Amino acid sequence: IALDIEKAKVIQSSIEYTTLKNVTSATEIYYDPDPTSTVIEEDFDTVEAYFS
Amino acid sequence: TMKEITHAISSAKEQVQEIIYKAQHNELELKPGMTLRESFEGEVSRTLNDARDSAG
Amino acid sequence: SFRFCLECNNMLYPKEDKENQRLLYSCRNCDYTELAEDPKVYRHELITNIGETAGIVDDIGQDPTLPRSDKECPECHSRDCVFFQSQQRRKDTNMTLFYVCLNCKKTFRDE
Numbered sequence: 001i002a003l004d005i006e007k008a009k010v011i012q013s014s015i016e017y018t019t020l021k022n023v024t025s026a027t028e029i030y031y032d033p034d035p036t037s038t039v040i041e042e043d044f045d046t047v048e049a050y051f052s
Numbered sequence: 053t054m055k056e057i058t059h060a061i062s063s064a065k066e067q068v069q070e071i072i073y074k075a076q077h078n079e080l081e082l083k084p085g086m087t088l089r090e091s092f093e094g095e096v097s098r099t100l101n102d103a104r105d106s107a108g
Numbered sequence: 109s110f111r112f113c114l115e116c117n118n119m120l121y122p123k124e125d126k127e128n129q130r131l132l133y134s135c136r137n138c139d140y141t142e143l144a145e146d147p148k149v150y151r152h153e154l155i156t157n158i159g160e161t162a163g164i165v166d167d168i169g170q171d172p173t174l175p176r177s178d179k180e181c182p183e184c185h186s187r188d189c190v191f192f193q194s195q196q197r198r199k200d201t202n203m204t205l206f207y208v209c210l211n212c213k214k215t216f217r218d219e
């Protein structure tokens with residue numbers, strides 16, 4: 001591994017501490033009374049595709 | 053020798069100006085473990101120290 | 109931006125009607141209740157950009173200590189402009205410049 005940069009980068013990624021806060025860009029809370037559907041039109045397609 | 057020293061100092065100032073433009077247009081490479089401002093400051097300091105050493 | 113009671117002036121808190129399955133904003137010192145229009149009850153931004161270009165005033169062209177450039181204004185196409193870097197001053201702030209013309213005062217960049 002010492003003489004190969006790719007494996008070294010793999011090890012470096014495996015060691016470094018990473019939390020959800022590191023990758024999270026924003027968080028939101030919504031009111032949505034239908035578990036099988038949604039109010040947001042943007043996320044409607046993905047949730048309906050998941051439910052089907 | 054004074055014209056050589058003046059030319060070296062002017063060249064270093066031109067290089068620092070180019071680095072400033074590159075940093076202001078987001079074209080500057082970032083040294084790992086350092087922010088954009090820190091990398092910019094380190095590069096400028098290194099350029100100026102090299103300028104003084106060359107003139108001396 | 110959050111609303112307040114129209115007769116008590118106190119802050120209206122979100123509430124849910126069990127029988128109606130609707131979101132409502134209800135005051136706590138009064139029985140006033142108003143229907144909620146948007147479902148976004150709460151939003152928190154981990155990475156934010158506000159405060160970067162919002163720091164604009166109409167009379168920023170009267171400052172003599174500000175450098176004057178010759179960048180072309182997209183709106184007025186004037187030959188005189190004043191530029192400054194980001195007002196937000198976090199440790200990881202970019203060094204991009206914001207150019208303000210003396211007629212339209214539109215903020216733009218060279219990117």
Ligand SMILES: [Zn+2]
Binds near residue numbers: 115116118135137
């Ligand atoms: Zn009230």
Ligand SMILES: [Zn+2]
Binds near residue numbers: 183185211212213
């Ligand atoms: Zn103008």
